[PDB]
Amino acid sequence: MYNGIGLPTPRGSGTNGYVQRNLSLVRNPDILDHERKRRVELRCLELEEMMEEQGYEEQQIQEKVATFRLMLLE
Amino acid sequence: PAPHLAREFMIKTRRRKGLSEDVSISKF
């Protein structure tokens, strides 16, 4: 009746209904290997140097920085 | 309770639409 509990009408049975609550209810090395190369490429990209306006000399300086970082990493 | 909630939602949703078993290396 109320909720899913009870009898639809108490007239047929010999009771009054009165449904009540039950009180008794209980209740990874490859990641580091790529990270080293990513740090090398980040140090290569951190050179940039768009103030001296060098062309292939900037590329040679970047190659020198990359070989220096490879020698320091070795 | 709280630590079983994601497992319950996973199991009931996969039973609702798909397959019950889940493999972490089901592709590779």
Binding site: Y2, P8, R11, G17 | K12
Partner: protein
């Protein structure tokens, strides 16, 4: 019309007298669907709603 009653309210005779929606492995229960939600939104929470009047909302 739904043969369900609030404990403060009155009781009446019934008016009219397998589902895979009632499968226990597909139903998530957090709060049980009580009588009050079946009265407030009667087309949502009741299969077979007949002779049902929509209640007034908030004033």
């Amino acid at each position: 019309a739904l043969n369900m009653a609030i404990p403060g309210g009155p009781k009446f005779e019934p008016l009219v007298r397998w589902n895979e929606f009632n499968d226990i492995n597909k139903i998530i229960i957090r709060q049980p669907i009580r009588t009050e939600y079946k009265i407030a939104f009667p087309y949502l929470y009741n299969n077979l709603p007949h002779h049902v009047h929509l209640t007034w909302y908030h004033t």
